[PDB]
């Protein structure tokens, strides 16, 4: 009837990125007056959203990244959405951010609005696939919405 | 079923060129069950053409290296264009600029631009102003009908 969707976000604690480890996304209720899980025929598992309904989806993410975590190594990261397992990354969902100097403050990342065929049991997660030094994820959010 | 299209480049970097549509050769993001994510649109290799009138959300992402340049600053302004590269869409613009050499890749995403489109409309991502060399490491164009 209504399209399937899910929204999971982290606005409660920064997290350090860890190679191929899905990002923690504990919250599903963004409305500050009337919070309610914005979840329909999906499942938020704590570090991702599981598909329950076959179809075409828009999936996307946002990250806030601080690159000031080292005194000697300029920091960088490459991020993707993964399908099923962290290694099974989705081409077209990739982003990158890299600083050649130490002490770089927050920068913003957003993926494209990725349109993709998904199937029941598909677990969509945000994964770092390459990290240069320590990367501080100040906040993150993952969006799943059925188009067809 | 809504019209939609998703075209991306995850296979080769490309230097930005003025009023030159970015190359977007791929339309199959699912790594396990690859299918063209194209319904009642056409991906022409450097953009997506509309076949059906309606309200669409159109948007793009860029991954841009600002340290693959013999001079600084490294800067670019980018828009979606309609039909022709000079015919840019107000509201679809983005911009980055590094005045020195301490920056590699940065991220850009346009807004999720809502817009009336019409059969024949060709949507492309164009640089409209550049300083230095601006390296497009990856890019993706999204079109999906609102209905």
């Amino acid at each position: 009837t209504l399209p399937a969707f899910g929204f999971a976000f982290n606005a409660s604690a920064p997290q350090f990125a860890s190679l191929f480890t899905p990002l923690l996304l504990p919250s599903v209720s963004p409305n500050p007056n009337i919070p309610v899980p914005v979840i329909n025929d999906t499942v938020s598992v704590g570090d991702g959203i599981r598909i329950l309904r076959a179809g075409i989806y828009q999936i996307s993410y946002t990250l806030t990244i601080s690159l000031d975590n080292s005194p000697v190594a300029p920091e960088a990261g490459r991020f993707f959405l993964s399908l099923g397992t962290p290694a099974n990354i989705i081409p077209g969902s990739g982003t990158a951010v890299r600083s050649n100097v130490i002490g770089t403050g927050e920068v913003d990342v957003s993926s494209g609005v990725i349109l993709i065929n998904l199937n029941p049991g598909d677990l969509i997660q945000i994964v770092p696939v390459q990290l240069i030094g320590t990367v501080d994820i100040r906040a993150a959010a993952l969006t799943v919405a059925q188009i067809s | 079923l809504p019209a939609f299209g998703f075209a991306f480049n995850a296979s080769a970097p490309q230097f930005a060129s003025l009023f030159t549509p970015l190359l977007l050769p791929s339309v199959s993001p699912n790594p396990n069950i690859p299918v063209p994510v194209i319904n009642d649109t056409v991906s022409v290799g450097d953009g997506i053409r509309i076949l059906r009138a309606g309200i669409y959300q159109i948007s793009y992402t860029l991954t841009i290296s600002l340290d693959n340049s013999p001079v600084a600053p490294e800067a670019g302004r980018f828009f979606l264009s309609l039909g022709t590269p000079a015919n840019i869409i107000p509201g679809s613009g983005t911009a980055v600029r590094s005045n020195v050499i301490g920056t590699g890749e940065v991220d850009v995403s346009s807004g999720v631009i809502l817009i009336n489109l019409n059969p024949g409309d060709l949507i492309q991502i164009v640089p409209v102003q550049l300083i230095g060399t601006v390296d497009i490491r990856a890019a993706a164009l999204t079109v999906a009908q609102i209905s």
């Binding site: 696939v129 | 995850a10 970097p13 693959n68 890749e105």
Partner: peptide, 13 residues
């Protein structure tokens, strides 16, 4: 495709 070869990659290290 290996993840080191899926764009975007770092233009330099």
């Amino acid at each position: 495709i290996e993840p080191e070869n899926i764009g975007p990659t770092f233009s330099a290290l």
